[PDB]
């Protein structure tokens, strides 16, 4: 099918019309997305088929055709770009300085940009163009606005 | 059934829309992968 590196929209014809349920990254022949986007189900790419290979509900991640390939990390200091791919709208880079999700298991970067739910799985980048995580799993703060984590997998 | 469609390249773009704040939150992550605010 289409295994070119890049950002992709995850679509479904199961609801009314064609609906964008999420977004994923294709890197080294491995498609990467959030678990709540696909629920682990198989994906189509033209005539080709992508079957899940690794997944974890707590991490809210899943990889197709191979192990998780993305291992770059936010340095805790620099600005990053959210390559937001919203439903029915063009891919657009948005630069921000991440906040912090302080947990009992440690700190995680967090991007405070709000987008439709079908934007989940849009990659967050460093100044070199490396995917430091996926956008789309977070919280709704005192203000009522959305703060997503910078969710990164593990390269075995 | 679900299917994918390419939406672009993964590249950093100079002079893009700079927006968003940087908050420090106390969060908790449950077994279902959902985040919640701890206060
Ligand atoms: C403001 O509420 C929400 C709820 C769910 C999602 S998924 C996403 N990427 N952004 C949001 C925002």
Nearest CA to ligand 1 atom 1: A146
| Residue A135: CB atoms within 10 Å | 25
Task: Look up A60 and say whether it is catalytic.
Answer: yes
Q: Are the beta carbons of A59 and A153 closer than 8 angstroms?
A: yes
A13 and A60 share a domain? yes
| Domain shared by A53 and A84, yes or no | no
In a domain, A70, yes or no: no
Residue A103 sits in a domain of what CATH number? 2.40.10.10
Q: What is the CATH number of the domain that holds A40?
A: 2.40.10.120
* d(C-alpha A118, C-alpha A89), whole Å: 11
In chain A, the largest separation of any two C-alpha atoms, in whole Å, equals 46
Spatial CA neighbour of A7 closest among A29, A36, A28, A31 = A31
Element (H, E) at B17: strand B17-18
Residue A1 lies in a domain: no
Q: Could you tell me if residue A69 is inside a domain?
A: no
Structurally, chain A folds into a number of domains equal to: 2
Q: Give the domain extent around A107.
A: 80-149
Q: Using the 8-state DSSP alphabet, how is residue B21 labeled?
A: -
Secondary structure string (H, E, C) spanning chain A:
CCCCCEEEEEEECCCCCCEEEEEEEEECCEEEECHHHHCCCCEEECCEEECEEEEECCCCEEEECCCCCCCCCCCCCCCEEEEECCCCCCCEEEEECCEEEEECCEEEEEECCCCCHHHCCEEEECCCCCEEEEECCEEECCCCCEEEECECCCCC
Q: Considering the domain boundaries, does residue A155 fall inside one? A: no
Q: Among A114, A112, A118, which residue's Cα sits nearest to residue A149?
A: A112
Q: Does B14 touch chain A (CB under 8 A)?
A: no
Q: What is the C-alpha separation between A139 and A20, in angstroms, rounded? A: 21
Q: What is the rounded CA–CA span in Å between residue A117 and residue A146?
A: 11
Residue nearest to ligand 1 atom 12, measured at CA: A146
Q: Is A120 an active-site residue?
A: yes
CA A5 to CA A11: how far, in whole Å?
Answer: 18
A141 found inside a domain: yes
In terms of domains, do A60 and A93 share one? Answer: no
């Amino acid at each position: 099918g289409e295994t070119t590196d890049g950002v992709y929209r995850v679509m479904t014809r199961r609801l009314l019309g064609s609906t964008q349920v999420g977004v994923g990254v294709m890197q080294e022949g491995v498609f990467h997305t959030m678990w709540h986007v696909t629920k682990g189900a198989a994906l189509r790419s033209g005539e080709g088929r992508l079957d899940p290979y690794w997944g974890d509900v707590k991490q809210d991640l899943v990889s197709y055709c191979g192990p998780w390939k993305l291992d770059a990390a936010w340095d805790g200091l620099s600005e990053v770009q959210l390559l937001a791919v919203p439903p029915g709208e063009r891919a657009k880079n948005i630069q921000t300085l991440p906040g912090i999700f302080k947990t009992k298991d440690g700190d995680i970067g967090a991007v405070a940009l709000d987008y439709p739910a079908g934007t989940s799985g849009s990659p967050i980048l460093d100044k070199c163009g490396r995917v430091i995580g996926l956008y789309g799993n977070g919280v709704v703060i005192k203000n009522g606005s959305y703060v997503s984590a910078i969710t990164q997998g593990k390269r075995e | 059934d679900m299917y994918i469609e390419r939406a672009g390249d993964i590249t950093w773009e100079k002079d893009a829309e700079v927006t968003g704040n940087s908050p420090r939150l106390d969060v908790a992550l449950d077994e279902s992968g959902d985040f919640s605010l701890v206060e």
